[PDB]
Each structure stands twice: as structure tokens, then as C-alpha cells.
């Protein structure tokens, strides 16, 4: 079941929007480098 660290938002080719981004499409299976940024579609 892994331990965490989804998948580098890049590994799948996505984007990182402010955690409080009112316009961020949750992109499962993937994480970011910024503990404050989110990994969304684009």
C-alpha cells in the first residue's frame, strides 16, 4: 500500500497550484515538491 509520496506531479505531467487554490483539479496518484503546493491536472 506504499507509505505516501504519491507520484512526482511531473512523472505524470501535471501542475502545482497553491494549496488554497480555488482552481485546482485534484490529480490523484502524484505529489509535489512544495509542502504547500497541490498537484492538479494542469
Curated annotation (Swiss-Prot):
Disulphide bridges: 9-39, 16-32, 24-40
GO CC, alphabetical: extracellular region
Organ and tissue specificity: Produced by the crural gland and detected in venom from the spur located on each male hind leg. Is also widely expressed in both male and female tissues, including brain, intestine, kidney, lung, spleen and testis.
Compartments where found: Secreted
Keywords: D-amino acid, Disulfide bond, Secreted, Signal, Toxin
Statement: the UniProt record of this protein carries the keyword Transmembrane: no
Post-translational modification: Stereoinversion of L-Met-26 (in DLP-4) to D-Met-26 (in DLP-2).
Keyword Magnesium among UniProt keywords: no
Gene Ontology molecular functions: toxin activity
Residue positions, PTM D-methionine: 2
Stated role: Does not show antimicrobial, myotoxic, hemolytic and cell-promoting activities.
Protein name: Defensin-like peptide 2/4
Organism: Ornithorhynchus anatinus (Duckbill platypus)
Classification lineage: Eukaryota, Metazoa, Chordata, Craniata, Vertebrata
Amino acid at each position: 500500500i506504499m507509505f505516501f509520496e504519491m507520484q512526482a506531479c511531473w512523472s505524470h505531467s501535471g501542475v502545482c497550484r497553491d494549496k488554497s487554490e480555488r482552481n485546482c483539479k485534484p490529480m490523484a496518484w502524484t505529489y509535489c515538491e512544495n509542502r504547500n503546493q497541490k498537484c492538479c491536472e494542469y
